[PDB]
UniProtKB/Swiss-Prot annotation, chain B:
Summary of the function given for this chain in its UniProt record: Attaches the virion to the cell membrane by interacting with host receptor, initiating the infection. Binding to human ACE2 and CLEC4M/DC-SIGNR receptors and internalization of the virus into the endosomes of the host cell induces conformational changes in the S glycoprotein. Proteolysis by cathepsin CTSL may unmask the fusion peptide of S2 and activate membrane fusion within endosomes.
Gene encoding the protein: S
Highest taxon of source: Viruses
Disulfide bond positions: C22-C32
Residues glycosylated per entry: N13
Protein name according to UniProt: Spike protein S1
Length: 97, 49
């Protein structure tokens, strides 16, 4: 069997790339407006130091993810004024001034 | 005298060769947090406010 006619399909595809980067102040959460908590926390040490390093390390990767996908061209091209090219109407994918 | 925090470099022969405040400017507190005298360019997170 050999096919004769054909068809053309456009198939969508959804992929996540990022995630909302966060940050947490310790004493607003683990102390919560009391100095005596902060008078007690210093026994435990600089755990606020290490977690801020970790979460910002996540936050560096989130900008790193978006940058490694998109930032691949080296000329900033211009959208042409025409949007219809021999039966190819790009009126829905290009932006509009 | 005042209650502060310093950072001291010892040499090979156990001699105090250099010190730094942790209170005079944000630049020295950056040296206090990263624990180094020479700091390359970039942003660096430090303590809260
Ligand atoms: C490429 O594809 C685009 C797809 O958007 C296509 O553009 C659209 O064309 C249609 C007509 O073919 C436009 O519809 C008309 O636009 C005018 C201007 O906005 C409106 O005033 C019109 O509304 C009146 O007329 C209608 C029928 O008479 C009534 O139903 C209506 O209530 C009003 O009385 C009508 O909507 C449409 O706006 C454009 N859209 C865009 C985004 O340009 C274009 O034609 C294609 N080109 C080629 C070469 O294939
Ligand atoms: C730590 O202390 C030691 C000794 O307490 C220091 O070593 C001494 O360094 C000096 C400087 O180089 C030496 O003097 C020179 O010695 C050479 C070789 O003998 C000679 O050719 C020169 O004319 C000059 O005299 C000294 O000999 C040396 N002594 C010893 C026991 O090693 C060391 O430099 C100190 N280091 C720091 C970082 O403070």
């Amino acid at each position: 069997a050999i096919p004769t006619n054909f068809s053309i399909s456009i198939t969508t595809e959804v992929m996540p790339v990022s995630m909302a980067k966060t940050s947490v102040d310790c004493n607003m959460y683990i102390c919560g407006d009391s100095t005596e908590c902060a008078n007690l926390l210093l026994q435990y040490g600089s755990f606020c130091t290490q977690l801020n390093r970790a979460l910002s390390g996540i936050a560096a990767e989130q900008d790193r993810n978006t940058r490694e996908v998109f930032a691949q061209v080296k000329q900033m091209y211009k959208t042409p004024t025409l949007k219809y090219f021999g039966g190819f109407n790009f009126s829905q994918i290009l932006p509009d001034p | 005298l005042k209650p502060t925090t310093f950072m001291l470099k010892y040499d090979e022969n156990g001699t105090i060769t250099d010190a730094v405040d942790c209170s005079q400017n944000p630049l020295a507190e950056l040296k206090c947090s990263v624990k180094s005298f020479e700091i390359d360019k970039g942003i660096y997170q430090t303590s809260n406010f």
